[PDB]
Amino acid sequence: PSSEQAWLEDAQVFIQKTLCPAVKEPNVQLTPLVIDCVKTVWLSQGRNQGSTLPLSYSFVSVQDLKTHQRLPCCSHLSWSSSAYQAWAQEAGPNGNPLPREQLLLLGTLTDLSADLEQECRNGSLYVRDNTGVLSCELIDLDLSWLGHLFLFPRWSYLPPARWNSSGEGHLELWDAPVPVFPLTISPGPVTPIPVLYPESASCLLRLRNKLRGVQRNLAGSLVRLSALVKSKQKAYFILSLGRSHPAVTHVSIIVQVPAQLVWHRALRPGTAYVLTELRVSKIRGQRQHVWMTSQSSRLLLLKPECVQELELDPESLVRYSRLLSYSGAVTGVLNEPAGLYELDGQLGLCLAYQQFRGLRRVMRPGVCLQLQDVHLLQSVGGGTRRPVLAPCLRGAVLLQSFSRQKPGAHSSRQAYGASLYEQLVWERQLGLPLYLWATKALEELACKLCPHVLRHHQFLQHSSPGSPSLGLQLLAPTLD
Amino acid sequence: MREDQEHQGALVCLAESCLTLEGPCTAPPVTHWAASRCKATGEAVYTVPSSMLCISENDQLILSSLG
Amino acid sequence: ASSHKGCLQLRDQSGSLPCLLLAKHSQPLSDPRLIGCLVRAERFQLIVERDVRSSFPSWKELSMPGFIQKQQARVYVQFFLADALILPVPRPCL
Amino acid sequence: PSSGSESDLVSLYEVERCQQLSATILTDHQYLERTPLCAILKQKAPQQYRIRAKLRSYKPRRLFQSVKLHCPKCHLLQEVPHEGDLDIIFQDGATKTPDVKLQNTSLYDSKIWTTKNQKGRKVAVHFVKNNGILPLSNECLLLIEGGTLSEICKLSNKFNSVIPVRSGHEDLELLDLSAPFLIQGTIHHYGCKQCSSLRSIQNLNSLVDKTSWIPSSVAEALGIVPLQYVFVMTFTLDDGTGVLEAYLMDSDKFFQIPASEVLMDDDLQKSVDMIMDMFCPPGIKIDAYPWLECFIKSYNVTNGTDNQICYQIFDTTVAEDVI
Ligand SMILES: [Zn+2]
């Protein structure tokens, strides 16, 4: 068949087998839908100056990608190397880019992980096709897209890392996904939802006694929120809504149902939202009560016609942190496994005191981010020069933009031992001005011994009852 | 002919954009070893006869015969 | 324990440094079991021994440099084993 | 010499079983017992041995000299040409006149240009066709006459692979095997003139396919023996019992670096430099150089009438974590 016709029949086979869901026959009625999607995005360019069908690009499955690929790769779908550069080097100057690759990615989007030992919510997000499952990250996410099947434009894959055992890459996305399923128009909350406004709701957060009659729903502008906290079994994160700002009252709330954990990814500060089917709880010793989500809670965006308001020192170096909020872009790394970074170079940035792990596999130069409620310190220990931000649970970290820059090289000297820095912080509970030095030390010991007298993954391993870590014993007498 | 001419023109565009259609030549990037060799040009290069490098196929034979 | 001179030497990246243990005050180190290990020492002394071989004519010249002919400099350490800590490199294995 | 007489002792090797961990692992023949170097010296050649050593020194120190081209058919190394050599080749094509009967054919079609300001240089481009039809760029074999080394390289970064040619009265022919018989992105392929018996571009009809363009396949079609890329060096392997000077000569085994690409990629060059300065750190005493276990063979040479007994390394690679 003709080049375009051969491309089309290859796409037919690809759809039928690789993509057509087990829930539905290898329906050919699906093929015109995806054909229309590729045609749309390709011709709507105009700049494409191409055949009706983009024959240059090709189709790749999840498992296909997983087995075959191991470089970072970008499908800046339907863009020329000129437009690509104009996007890639906007994270420049000299932003070492991902490579331009002409692939098309089609798959189902869900929170459900590939594991079935539990629900395995863990606030995680994944792409699934007939071939395999893969985790993904998505700026300005829309939760409605859950469970739906899409074409993905302007998409990027990051490979697993040499040091990492799980050997899993992950996806990064730059634009809304297009559903193969025709536009699924659905109604909205016509009736004004009965919600408690922030003043009455906060008075209730003090006077937990008066939670009767007024519907257990809420609304307001998101003023404050935690990072996604995890216990050893429970996971949760806290948020607060204000009538305005500066406002007399803000309503603190906690999300805690495992299935709802994904909610965390969606919200954003300032934007006003609506919460539903709530209660107020008294966590152990937390006398200032909070609203909490139930088995039936739902979260929604706020819209005027959709609400029904309801009202009832050189002499003593002990120095102070300055709470603030900030945004910008990281510009390097000083110790990836521990968690240090240079925000625009000007200002030190730790990150240790979070659960943090979820942010590792993204964080790299050219990443743009926003911080809310974050301690700032100066003149810190170890003679370190710059000021240092240092988010903590009462704060939260927010992505502005993924980085067009590809990751740098591996090197055992840099890549190893995250568990050890973490173990220090949580078993010993140091304070940051001591933790900076407690890095620089192990960075100097592993400059003598390793690898020759002893290899890193023997020296820096996280100390365990089965064996103490030499990277802990050597410091202990000074530290303790 | 639209598709055919489009394809041949993509090829011709690659070629011409790569070809120095006018003006003087330009210097391509140079790597560490290449620049160092160029700077060292005048050095007599290290080399070894292939004889010292196991031209003795008989020794190869009786070696591969060993367990 | 180094092969050439017997003298207990400390060796680590970039080179080596001679040393002079003492089990405890007025008693010498006594069991071979202690070769191989890591010793962390922080209450120790660092010595030198300048072996100059100048040729000054008169005391006057001592005010000047232009008469020294050679130079060397022993250097080493010494400490008790009540102060430093011994650490047994766990027999390296995968 | 006061301190020299002591340095003559202080720089000696130490013994044969330290605390420190090896730097190299032999992939095969691990069952072989360690044979002291002295024991080897006292024995005949050829023979296999498994040893441990430290590199007292290595050659060439100027590591840009550590790669060679090798022709296996006549087993004889070949020095790598310089860019000045390529330029001395290509310069003769810049002035040639294209021929009308070499432009468009059943196998290839062409497009022409005259580059201005460059002394009136003439250039012609030819595109090979699959089953008579131009294939996509990823499978488009392209031919050039009059293009410079940098231009053909940048063009090979774009097309599948490209062949320098000149106007042969019958059909296009490689302008000079001193220039690449095939330049494939970062790889410049060279051949052995003594072993080659080349053919014209029409002989691409002998290929099993016109889409893969496997360098070996196209070489065979154009009747050219492709040269192998190899690392080659010799090392001072000291054991205290004795010191031995073996040879290395391989492609992407020990170093685990492609000898084919290392010349054109700077990261690989950094890597190999790191490896060698790690086995042999600058300045400090061999007292601190790491142990190196490997597997070697011995053999005769007799290039100077007799003996010249020699040793070569085999089946050994740098450990993973020490890279
Ligand atoms: Zn040959």
Side-chain angles (χ1 to χ4, degrees), chain A residues 164-363:
Chain A
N164 200 323
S165 69
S166 66
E168 192 228 9
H170 66 84
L171 214 70
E172 291 185 11
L173 296 165
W174 285 73
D175 193 10
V178 181
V180 63
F181 304 151
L183 304 188
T184 62
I185 297 164
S186 304
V190 176
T191 58
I193 303 165
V195 305
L196 276 152
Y197 229 56
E199 283 178 43
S200 54
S202 303
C203 184
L204 288 161
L205 282 188
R206 285 181 277 99
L207 304 176
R208 188 173 181 238
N209 310 62
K210 292 183 177 183
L211 289 161
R212 61 197 76 253
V214 284
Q215 167 55 18
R216 51 216 181 88
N217 302 340
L218 290 176
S221 295
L222 176 49
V223 287
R224 159 179 166 192
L225 75 171
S226 69
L228 171 50
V229 183
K230 297 212 305 170
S231 74
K232 296 302 185 294
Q233 193 284 337
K234 296 292 296 193
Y236 38 86
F237 91 95
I238 284 71
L239 63 160
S240 183
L241 307 180
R243 184 168 188 165
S244 292
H245 207 260
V248 179
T249 57
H250 58 57
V251 188
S252 297
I253 319 173
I254 187 168
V255 182
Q256 66 84 26
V257 181
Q260 301 175 357
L261 290 169
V262 67
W263 296 8
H264 172 74
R265 295 178 170 261
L267 297 308
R268 289 298 183 279
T271 300
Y273 297 92
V274 168
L275 273 287
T276 62
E277 329 311 341
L278 309 160
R279 291 190 65 253
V280 175
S281 51
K282 182 171 181 285
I283 295 157
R284 290 160 52 252
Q286 313 300 309
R287 195 266 178 187
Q288 291 299 343
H289 322 96
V290 295
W291 290 84
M292 63 85 73
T293 58
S294 69
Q295 169 70 87
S296 58
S297 286
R298 196 59 45 202
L299 83 177
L300 298 164
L301 189 67
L302 182 61
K303 196 62 59 174
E305 69 279 13
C306 302
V307 64
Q308 166 190 1
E309 306 88 337
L310 306 176
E311 281 282 325
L312 294 167
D313 186 308
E315 192 276 327
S316 175
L317 306 171
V318 186
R319 281 202 276 269
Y320 300 80
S321 66
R322 170 168 175 72
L323 291 74
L324 67 84
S325 295
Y326 182 88
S327 297
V330 287
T331 54
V333 304
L334 277 287
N335 184 306
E336 192 201 276
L340 281 62
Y341 291 82
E342 299 288 10
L343 278 173
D344 308 312
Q346 304 148 240
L347 313 174
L349 164 62
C350 169
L351 297 175
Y353 298 101
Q354 285 186 346
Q355 205 63 15
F356 163 78
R357 184 174 40 68
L359 261 287
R360 185 182 174 176
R361 67 191 200 156
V362 179
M363 290 284 298

Side-chain angles (χ1 to χ4, degrees), chain A residues 123-138:
Chain A
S124 301
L125 193 70
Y126 300 87
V127 173
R128 313 185 303 185
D129 64 359
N130 304 347
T131 73
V133 176
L134 172 66
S135 66
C136 56
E137 309 302 345
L138 177 53

Side-chain angles (χ1 to χ4, degrees), chain D residues 19-83:
Chain D
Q19 319 79 42
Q20 299 186 346
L21 295 172
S22 172
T24 308
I25 60 176
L26 77 176
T27 72
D28 209 353
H29 326 291
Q30 307 82 340
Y31 51 74
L32 296 176
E33 177 184 350
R34 167 178 153 83
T35 312
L37 270 60
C38 58
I40 299 175
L41 301 172
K42 299 180 295 182
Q43 294 178 18
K44 61 178 184 179
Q47 246 291 22
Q48 305 173 7
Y49 301 104
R50 207 287 297 279
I51 63 164
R52 285 160 37 80
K54 299 176 173 182
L55 276 70
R56 179 169 287 270
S57 62
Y58 67 94
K59 291 203 294 283
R61 298 297 195 115
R62 286 174 293 277
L63 285 166
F64 59 85
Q65 304 180 21
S66 62
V67 169
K68 298 290 183 184
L69 292 162
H70 188 60
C71 184
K73 197 58 53 175
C74 64
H75 186 275
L76 183 264
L77 272 172
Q78 181 157 338
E79 266 64 28
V80 193
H82 297 171
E83 290 188 356

Side-chain angles (χ1 to χ4, degrees), chain D residues 224-295:
Chain D
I224 287 163
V225 173
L227 295 167
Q228 299 162 342
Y229 276 101
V230 290
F231 307 103
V232 181
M233 280 216 279
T234 182
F235 306 114
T236 311
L237 304 177
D238 187 354
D239 183 58
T241 73
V243 58
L244 182 147
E245 293 197 348
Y247 295 104
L248 186 72
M249 176 180 65
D250 80 286
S251 308
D252 191 16
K253 195 185 299 298
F254 168 65
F255 294 102
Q256 307 180 333
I257 295 288
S260 177
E261 305 177 330
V262 65
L263 291 181
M264 301 305 300
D265 310 351
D266 195 79
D267 56 353
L268 309 180
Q269 302 161 32
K270 257 73 171 185
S271 311
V272 175
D273 297 337
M274 171 279 298
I275 293 295
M276 287 309 301
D277 61 50
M278 167 275 298
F279 292 139
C280 299
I284 67 181
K285 299 304 186 186
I286 196 178
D287 199 48
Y289 283 18
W291 274 95
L292 180 133
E293 185 184 64
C294 61
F295 167 78

